[PDB]
Amino acid sequence: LARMGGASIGRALDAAVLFGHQKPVTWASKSLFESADDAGQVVAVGNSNGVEGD
Amino acid sequence: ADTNRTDAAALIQEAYSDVFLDSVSETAKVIGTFPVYNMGTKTTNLPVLSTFP
């Protein structure tokens, strides 16, 4: 349970920073996904066999 | 009027060869491939973690 308690907190921090999952409302910064998404810096992978470069 | 192979026949022994004679071979692989545990009884229990916080 000591190993489990520690590891549980590390996982919850990553998910907040990267994707904003349960991000504290007092964190004024955008999460990494949200920062890119609001900037429009998003690339969709395609199904072109790379003919579309995607 | 001649001594042919059918007359000489009792004098004509055949030979034997081992060139195509092999035993079976052990082809089996799982005991060589995977981990082996020596059991001392019919059953062993193996506990595992299932869920966490």
Q: How far is CA A2 from CA A10, A14, A15, B53, in A?
A: 13, 20, 21, 11
Q: Are A16 and A24 in contact (CB under 8 A)?
A: yes
Please give the Cα distance from A9 to B44 (Å, whole number).
35
Which sign, positive or negative, has the C-alpha torsion B4, B8, B9, B15?
Answer: negative
Q: How many helices (H) and strands (E) does chain B have?
A: 2, 0
Residues of A in Cβ contact (< 8 Å) with B52: 4, 7-8
Please give the Cα distance from A32 to A18 (Å, whole number).
5
Please give the Cα distance from B31 to B29 (Å, whole number).
6
Please give the Cα distance from A38 to A19 (Å, whole number).
13
- Scan residues 8-37 of A and list those with Cβ closer than 8 Å to B: 8
Please give the Cα distance from A43 to A48 (Å, whole number).
14
Q: What is the DSSP track for A11-50?
A: HHHHHHHHH-TT--TT--SPPHHHHHHHHT------SSTT
Q: Is B16 on the interface with A (CB under 8 A)?
A: no
